[PDB]
Amino acid sequence: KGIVLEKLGIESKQPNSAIRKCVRVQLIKNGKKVTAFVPNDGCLNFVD
């Protein structure tokens, strides 16, 4: 389980340009930070 931190607009070119709509998340139990993919949203209007 985690608490979100930021909005990561990473651009990733070859071969497919993935417009990465993904969220940096701080976990709870250990206090280290991982990146995290948000599926199926075209807009990411849900994970604020």
Partner: protein, 286 residues
Amino acid sequence: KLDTSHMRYLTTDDFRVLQAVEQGSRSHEVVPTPLIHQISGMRSQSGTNRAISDLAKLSLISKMRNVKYDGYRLTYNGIDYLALKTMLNRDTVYSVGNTIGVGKESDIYKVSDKNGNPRVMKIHRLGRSNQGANWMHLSRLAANKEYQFMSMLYSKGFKVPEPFDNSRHIVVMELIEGYPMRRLRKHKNIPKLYSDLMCFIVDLANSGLIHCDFNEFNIMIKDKLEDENDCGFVVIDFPQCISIQHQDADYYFQRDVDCIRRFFKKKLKYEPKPDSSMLDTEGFGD
């Protein structure tokens, strides 16, 4: 041929892809699809395909697939276009084209700047097309060496005009409001210009430069004023020049003097009262 109206159909990404093509085509012989996809450093395959299709339907990139080897080939007009974009990055070319004079290896159009002043251009199409690399490379180096010749002639007080840039084999020159003697009919002060035109031969040969094709069609005469008739003599003999250390300069020199005396005895009916400038005095002058 060259139809310059079509390169403004291209976006920023299209000549970014064209810059990737000219970067990848100078390392190998034929550049394929993934070197254009990778050397460009841009995001998507789709934009590369759209830009390559934009150059293809404008006949700037030729698609070739010789048995499982996809590749692309630059024509003359694409490298003319990217040279004019890197001329636009040097913020001077703005609006191009009236064809005045078609040479063998250099075609002359009529251009302008952002300031709106009248200028011209010198393209270089060596071979006109079975494109390789030697033709366009030799056009590029010929344009470069005539740019250094052009700057060296302008820097030494001659009546040879001002250069600006040597953007690949595309050479941008100042327009001169000048007339040839095919159009010119009669002049008031013919011996003064004849003195200026032997003095031009004298200080070229003192510099060591021997302009050989020095016919009537060479001399361009600017008319600065209409009330006082101020004059300037523009000489275009740039690929036919030969050095003073060459072995066959003697009949070139007396041919230049013989042509100027026969052209001034034919049309304007003016005879040289001083003697002709012979080769050895100019040889010791350099």
